[PDB]
Design a protein around this ligand. Structure first.
Ligand SMILES: [Cl-]
Ligand SMILES: [Cl-]
Length: 124
């Protein structure tokens, strides 16, 4: 079993790099974080900030989530973010992703005590 907090860290946290290096970034990252083990994760986002900074977003701007839940938070400043999406020629187990790097505000859902990110809603 894996806690929600831990799953968010695995799926969305990447403080090792300051941004998406190349176009293959999303390919090897979706792999190293085990997001291609049993299925190709269609869409996934990586935040290139310190965990501390991402966790802090749980105390930033409270916004609604796409699903309507009122526990989403948007970061006051922009963050280095990498979006990963399957390309047209992506088929399990040969997943292929388009890596798109940018700096936008991250929006996550927080819950529990300690109150930390447990899901990544979107990035604006
Ligand atoms: Cl995501
Ligand atoms: Cl600060």
């Amino acid at each position: 079993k894996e806690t929600a907090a831990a799953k968010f860290e695995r799926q969305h946290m990447d403080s090792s790099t300051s941004a998406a290096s190349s176009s293959n970034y999303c390919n090897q990252m979706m792999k190293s974080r085990n997001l291609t083990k049993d299925r190709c994760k269609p869409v996934n986002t990586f935040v290139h900030e310190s965990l501390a900074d991402v966790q802090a977003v749980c105390s930033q701007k409270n916004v609604a989530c796409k699903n309507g839940q009122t526990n989403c938070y948007q970061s006051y400043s922009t963050m280095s973010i990498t979006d990963c999406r399957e390309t047209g020629s992506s088929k399990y187990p040969n997943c292929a992703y388009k890596t798109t790097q940018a700096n936008k505000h991250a929006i996550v859902a927080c819950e529990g005590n300690p109150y930390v990110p447990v899901h990544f809603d979107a990035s604006v």
